Paper text:
Finally, we obtained crystals of OTP86DYW belonging to space group C2 and diffracting to a resolution of 2.5 Å. The structure was solved by single-wavelength anomalous dispersion (SAD) phasing harnessing four zinc atoms (c for details). Remarkably, the deaminase fold of OTP86DYW is interrupted by an insertion of about 55 residues that bridge β-strand 2 and α-helix 2. We conclude that the OTP86DYW active site seems to have limited accessibility for sub-strate cytidines, which is conferred by an insertion (H837-G891), and we thus term this insertion gating domain. In OTP86DYW, the motif terminates with the DSW sequence and provides two ligands (C954, C956) for a second zinc ion (Zn2); two more ligands are part of the deaminase domain (H924 and H947), indicating that Zn2 only has a structural role within [name] domains. Notably, the surface charge distribution of OTP86DYW reveals a region of positively charged residues spanning across the active site and passing in between the base of the gating domain’s β-finger and the [name] motif. The inactive structure zinc coordination is maintained by coordinating H892, C920, C923 and a more distant water molecule, whereas the catalytically important E894 is ionically bonded to K915; K915 also hydrogen bonds to S828 and S893. In this configuration, the ion pair will reduce the basic character of E894 and hinder the required deprotonation of the deaminating water, which is not productively coordinated by Zn1 and also not contacted by E894. We reason that beyond the steric inhibition through the gating domain, K915 has to be released before efficient catalysis can occur. For example, the cytidine bound to MmCD causes steric clashes with the β-finger of the OTP86DYW gating domain when positioned in the active site of OTP86DYW.
Residue numbers in the entry:
A (entry chain A), B (entry chain A): 826 to 841, 845 to 960
The structure:
Amino acid sequence: GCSWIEMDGKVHKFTASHPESKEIYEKLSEVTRKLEREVGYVADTKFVLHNVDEGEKVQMLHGHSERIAIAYGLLRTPDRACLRITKNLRVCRDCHTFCKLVSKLFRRDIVMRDANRFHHFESGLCSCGDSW
Amino acid sequence: GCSWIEMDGKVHKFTASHPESKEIYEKLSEVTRKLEREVGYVADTKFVLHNVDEGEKVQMLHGHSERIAIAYGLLRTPDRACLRITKNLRVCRDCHTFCKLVSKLFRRDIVMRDANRFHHFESGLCSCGDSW
Ligand SMILES: [Zn+2]
Ligand SMILES: [Zn+2]
Ligand SMILES: [Zn+2]
Ligand SMILES: [Zn+2]
């Protein structure tokens, strides 16, 4: 599970969590805090335990790699700039809503190509009509 | 959270899980499998996560230390022998039922003194009347 952002032929990859910088995750924390304060949106925490009993580690079901890529793009690309995100998996439903809200809240188009579909987000809505 | 078993002035302590022997936990596995097959009893798995997100470890809410002590006593003490268990905590409800079923299924008295009460198990019932 990984995600790339394309900025005029510049590609950066994001997975998982070894931070490229700490200012990305603080940008991401302020963006997510914006979503809950502005529109009252909270994502759902999903995880697995391969065995519940006695000291197993928590494994998250969705890496949310594109969220980090979006935060990166809001830092390095100028305003109104289209964020171009690529994913090798199917975008999860919470991240799809995340992209919609960001595209409207921050007034930026987002062209996401996931494992099977091009998602063009603009002004809060997507080209796929929320069917993918 | 620990538990002691007293065998004629011989005291063994059990916590957590570094096994004294592997034959104790295989005795315990066969005893618990007896409880589900004979009387259809399954315990409830309770645990905590201090933070759900991203790789935290699972911490169990009840160590069930006396269960290991009981299995130990069924190995080293002869039949009909009273198992004397001490706990520094309050015996949990599932372990209290565990002690009741064992005292009837294996025909042994169990004198458990927990953090505040003497529990005398015999023939499936306890001296506390399931109020502790
Ligand atoms: Zn996601
Ligand atoms: Zn879409
Ligand atoms: Zn217990
Ligand atoms: Zn009792």
